[PDB]
Amino acid sequence: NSDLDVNTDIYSKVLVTAIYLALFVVGTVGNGVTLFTLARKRVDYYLGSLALSDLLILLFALPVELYNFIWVHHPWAFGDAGCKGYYFLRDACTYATALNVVSLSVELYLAICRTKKFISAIWLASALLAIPMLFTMGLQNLSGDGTHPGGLVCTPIVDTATLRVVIQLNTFMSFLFPMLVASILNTVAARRLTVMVHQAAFNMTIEPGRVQALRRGVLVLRAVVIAFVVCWLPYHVRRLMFVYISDEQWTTALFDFYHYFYMLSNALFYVSSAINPILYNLAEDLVEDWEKARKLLEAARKGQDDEVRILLANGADVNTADETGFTPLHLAAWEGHLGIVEVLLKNGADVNANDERGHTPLHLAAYTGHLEIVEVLLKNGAGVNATDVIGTAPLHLAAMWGHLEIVEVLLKNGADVNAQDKFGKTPFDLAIDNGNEDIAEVLQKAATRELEVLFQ
């Protein structure tokens, strides 16, 4: 049946077979272990679908395709079921994949500005959109006489105009539309964050854990969109070609080019399936870091030395922050956890971290009257004369709230006795306003000592 022969060289097929087997043995294992691991252990519901659609594609489509579309172009060896089935399955699984990707972008965006049911809607809608493949594809005998058994081939059973509509809509619905929508959400999400980073930078010393996580989420989701554009554009271009050249432009050269482009287009297609477990690992590590950062902020407040040292050892960011810009060391200083202040300083917590209101840990230790925390913060080189947005120094707070011992150690660590806030009030002024005579006296003698120095 010479008319139906492809004439791709043997090596070409052997090379694609080597590549297909590579993608299959690694991709199946990869996507299998991804599901198996979620079964064992919100975002996970999404990564399950993606892992499942790819596993279904690599397990059922790729072996069938390697046989009847790479090696043996005729006849079709899987019946009108296998024909309509292969195409239905593929359309379903890509649709499922594409819609999940839109969900992740939507979910990320909403975070930056029930689920188990939502997943099932995605899959069922994937079955719906894929049904037109059950009516367009089928077996036909294109052999010379019109009855030769070796000319039985799986191929469109409708006219070109009909096939143009399904394929153009398929190109729209499964590829262009959802990937554009994701690109738009990806870009807005990114933009919204980038101003958060500037605003945080303007005030804080450290931007929050929630931002650092969503920031890294934008980059991965961007990579996945770029990944599909590359892996899916050739494929769709090849299927438009099939229904955009009529019959009277199809030269023997253009016929040969198509079956090579088919090997290449469908190599790249299966590559998206085999890369998915990378996205899974990136997303999961991004999520695990956030939870550890979150768990470490609870532990620092609650004063749980054990949980802290487990989280720090297992890689938790010592200098993570909340929306306020509160680090673990801020929380430990504030809650009066001397032991936790010391473990956080050992593991390199920033001693001069500023929150939104420009409060260092020393500010919070000097406000709440923890002499031993003040002493340890200062031992590790805290800013004695660090001033908040109001121009309040730690010595202001110590003097205002009557922490004489803190005043004395602050003074002897080089505190400016004469520091003034926005409203020009000195520690001494604050000491008197509230009625701390012993402090006010210590301060005024310090003030006097400095006068003497000027006049000699």
């Binding site: 594809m137 036909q140 191929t155 299927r239 099939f242 019959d247 199809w250 016929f255 079956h259």
Partner: peptide, 5 residues
Amino acid sequence: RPYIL
């Protein structure tokens, strides 16, 4: 014209 899509 090809027959495989």
